[PDB]
DNA sequence: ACTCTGACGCTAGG
DNA sequence: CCTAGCGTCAG
């Protein structure tokens, strides 16, 4: 009515008054309206249509004086800002765009609370709307209150609740919302009225969720760590990483050829034509037909079976690699198929315009880690794999596909052995704490443990030490460890308990974490992220033990996640305030930050990055203090696959 | 013919 | 331990 305004049609004095209102507002409540018109308020999770505009409820008083008559608007008014392009571009569109950008920037820099249901989407839309006028540094300081993220911090198990869900759950009480109205199942007036009402309700819900966050002790985490990350993710989604289409296209062909060769060999040695991609048929061949479990390697496999017959898993197959020529073939086939199918064919399916951009999910996991999708840049092969060309030696690197846009170079910052250091901090183990006080830590760990001083003793042990380290880090077991490393259950158990009896504190830390869980009913990371595990109270001992394992794992994994997010935020903030530095965060591989930076700026930024990241050891606030320093490894290069170390 | 869905399995990243 | 993504297969 008078509560809904198109800012294009405001008189200019009213435009000025509007800007002043946005400056003096108590709270801003924002949702994105699509062409339906639907909203971020549900229940559709991904809009099949595109963005029409942004609706902003301007609250002149926040629930948690004196009358004002503005006269061009009522109290409290909803303003509408058109994002969508028109059919014809001209000067008037330029003008409209100018005022719109001014308003949206006022939304970005305002001193009041800004509540948006999905904040990253909104920030991204605004970021693309600014275009030329603005850079990513404009939105760096934006803090939206995202109720979804709050509800995620409370109950991490459910990643994607709708708005109507959250209202029912955390809103007290009896509030009904109609979020489903669109043009064509109803009028505008209905859509708009419901938008206003639902925006008010959104404010209510957000405030409730904030207080609950304060109750559960999650507030400082929410504000300090989760919220400042939103514009960072939005910026990463607003930038595309160039990739080679030509190269992939070829390689795909090559890998296809090799795959057929391998399929032919497999059918040859198996003694029949089966489905090379079917694990069931291979399961029947290896075991029902060739009967290899029964043969020399009996009980090498997990049991005579996991059930009747063992699995086709790489452990089982590696146990059989001497018995028959098939397992090796299946393995190489799996490797090549993985690379081609996912790292090339799928990466070709993602790209637009010589480049790809991953979608980031903050509420994605229960450990507090980020997840990346379509394509998952966190799951890209680290080590280049070698194949024998069909028709010389052929080398293939998936990470070599991602190249910087000259003139720019990639700058990668890795947290060295961060899980182990977090574990040291938590356990407070004397020997591990002695270990870090610089040069190739895992080797020195291998020596200190094995009491063998070999300068760089066996690489295989370097791998064994790592494998048992992670066997205990993600806890725990004799069986699973055994599966990782190629040795029998007893040997794995002895390796494990040797390690745990060399460092006593770790067992004590684990026991303490389990004790905490059962007591509270959840477990807590360093910065206060909580992982509820009700099955810790379960009478079933398998469930109980599983909950214990999860409890032990979440402390380490979640703490590492906290530190990575913190580093992300601190570096982003550090760069965002520079006269000079253009370095842009491109992606985060969990413990590795990947930047694209201007070629000349390399020494200046690499300084800033390492300085910023290493100082994360001591920070207030929160009362964060680490028992062990954080070593940061820097590298640079024109391609992601090839990065030459720096300093 | 065609496309979905959901249970199950493997492997890469950490 | 926990992700994304690629497979089969039956309905």
UniProtKB/Swiss-Prot annotation:
Share an example GO biological-process annotation for this protein.
DNA-templated DNA replication
The molecular function terms in GO held by this entry are: cyclin binding; DNA binding; DNA-directed DNA polymerase activity
Keyword Ribosomal protein tagged: no
What is the reported tissue distribution? Highly expressed in testis and heart. Weakly expressed in skeletal muscle.
Single GO cellular component annotation?
nucleoplasm
Q: How is its activity regulated?
A: Inhibited by ddTTP.
Catalyses which reaction?
Answer: DNA(n) + a 2'-deoxyribonucleoside 5'-triphosphate = DNA(n+1) + diphosphate
UniProt-annotated location(s): Nucleus
Primary localization: nucleus
Principal EC category: transferase
Q: What outcome is documented for mutating residue 463 to R in this protein?
A: Reduces polymerase activity. No effect on accuracy
This enzyme's EC code(s)? 2.7.7.7
Annotated function:
DNA polymerase with very low fidelity that catalyzes considerable misincorporation by inserting dTTP opposite a G template, and dGTP opposite a T template. Is the least accurate of the DNA polymerase A family (i.e. POLG, POLN and POLQ). Can perform accurate translesion DNA synthesis (TLS) past a 5S-thymine glycol. Can perform efficient strand displacement past a nick or a gap and gives rise to an amount of product similar to that on non-damaged template. Has no exonuclease activity. Error-prone DNA polymerase that preferentially misincorporates dT regardless of template sequence.
Q: Which family does it belong to?
A: Belongs to the DNA polymerase type-A family.
Subunit details for this protein? Interacts with FANCD2, FANCI, PCNA, RAD51 and HELQ.
- Name the UniProt record assigns to this protein: DNA polymerase nu
Q: From which source organism is this entry?
A: Homo sapiens
Give the stretch of the parent protein shown, with its full length: 194 to 859 of 900
């Amino acid at each position: 009515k008078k509560h809904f305004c198109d800012i294009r049609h405001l008189d200019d004095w009213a435009k000025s008054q509007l800007i002043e209102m946005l400056k003096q507002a108590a709270a801003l409540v924002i949702t994105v309206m699509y062409t339906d018109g639907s909203t971020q308020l549900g229940a559709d999770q991904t809009p099949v249509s595109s963005v029409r505009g942004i609706v902003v409820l301007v609250k002149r008083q926040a629930e948690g004086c004196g009358p004002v008559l503005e006269g061009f608007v009522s109290d409290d008014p909803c303003i509408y800002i058109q994002i969508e392009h028109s059919a014809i571009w001209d000067q008037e569109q330029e003008a409209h765009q100018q005022f719109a950008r001014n308003v949206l920037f006022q939304t970005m820099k305002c001193k009041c609370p800004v509540i948006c249901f999905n904040a990253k989407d909104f920030v991204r839309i605004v970021l693309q709307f600014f275009g030329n006028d603005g850079s990513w540094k404009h939105v760096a300081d934006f803090i939206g209150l995202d109720p979804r993220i709050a509800a995620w911090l409370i109950d991490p198990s459910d990643a994607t609740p709708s708005f109507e869900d959250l209202v029912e759950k955390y809103c007290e009480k009896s509030i009904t919302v109609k979020v489903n109205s669109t043009y064509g199942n109803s009028s505008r007036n209905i859509v708009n009225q419901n938008v206003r009402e639902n925006l008010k309700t959104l404010y209510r819900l957000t405030m409730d969720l904030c207080s609950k966050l304060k109750d559960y002790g999650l507030w400082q985490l929410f504000r300090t760590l989760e919220l400042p990350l939103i514009p960072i993710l939005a910026v990463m989604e607003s930038h595309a990483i160039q990739v080679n289409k030509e190269e992939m296209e070829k390689t795909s062909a090559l890998l296809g050829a090799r795959l057929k060769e391998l399929e032919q060999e497999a059918h040859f040695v198996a003694g029949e034509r089966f489905l090379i991609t079917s694990n069931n048929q291979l399961r029947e061949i290896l075991f029902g037909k060739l009967k290899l479990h029964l043969l020399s390697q009996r009980n090498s496999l997990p049991r005579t079976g996991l059930q009747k017959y063992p699995s086709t898993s790489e452990a089982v197959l590696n146990a059989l690699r001497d018995l028959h020529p098939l397992p090796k073939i299946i393995l190489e086939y799996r490797q090549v198929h993985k690379i081609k199918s996912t790292f090339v064919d799928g990466l070709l399916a993602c790209m637009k315009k010589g480049s790809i951009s991953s979608t980031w999910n903050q509420t994605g996991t229960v450990t507090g880690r980020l997840s990346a999708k379509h394509p998952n840049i966190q799951g890209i092969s680290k080590h280049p794999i070698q194949i024998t060309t069909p028709k010389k030696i052929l080398t293939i690197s998936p990470r070599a596909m991602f190249v910087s846009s000259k003139g720019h170079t990639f700058l990668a910052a890795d947290f060295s052995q961060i899980e182990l250091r977090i574990l040291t901090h938590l356990s407070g183990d004397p020997e591990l704490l002695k270990l870090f006080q610089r040069d190739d830590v895992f080797s020195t760990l291998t020596s200190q443990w094995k009491d063998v001083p070999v300068e760089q003793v066996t690489h295989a042990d370097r791998e064994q030490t790592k494998k048992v380290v992670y066997a205990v880090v993600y806890g725990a077991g004799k069986e699973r460890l055994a599966a990782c490393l190629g040795v029998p259950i007893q040997e794995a158990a002895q390796f494990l308990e040797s390690f745990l009896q060399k460092y006593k504190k770790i067992k004590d830390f684990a026991r303490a974490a389990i004790a905490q869980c059962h007591q509270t009913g959840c477990v807590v990371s360093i910065m206060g992220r909580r992982r509820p595990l009700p099955r810790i109270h379960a009478h079933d001992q398998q469930l109980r033990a599983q909950a214990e394992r999860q409890a032990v794992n979440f402390v380490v994994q979640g703490s590492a996640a906290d530190l990575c997010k913190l580093a992300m935020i601190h570096v982003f903030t550090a760069v965002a305030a520079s006269h000079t530095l253009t370095a842009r965060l491109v992606a985060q591989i969990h413990d590795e930050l990947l930047f694209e930076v201007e070629d000349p700026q390399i020494p200046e930024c690499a300084a800033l990055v390492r300085r910023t990241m290493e100082s994360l050891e001591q920070v207030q606030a929160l009362e964060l203090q680490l028992q062990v320093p954080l070593k940061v490894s820097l590298s640079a290069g024109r391609s992601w696959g090839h990065l030459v170390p720096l300093q």
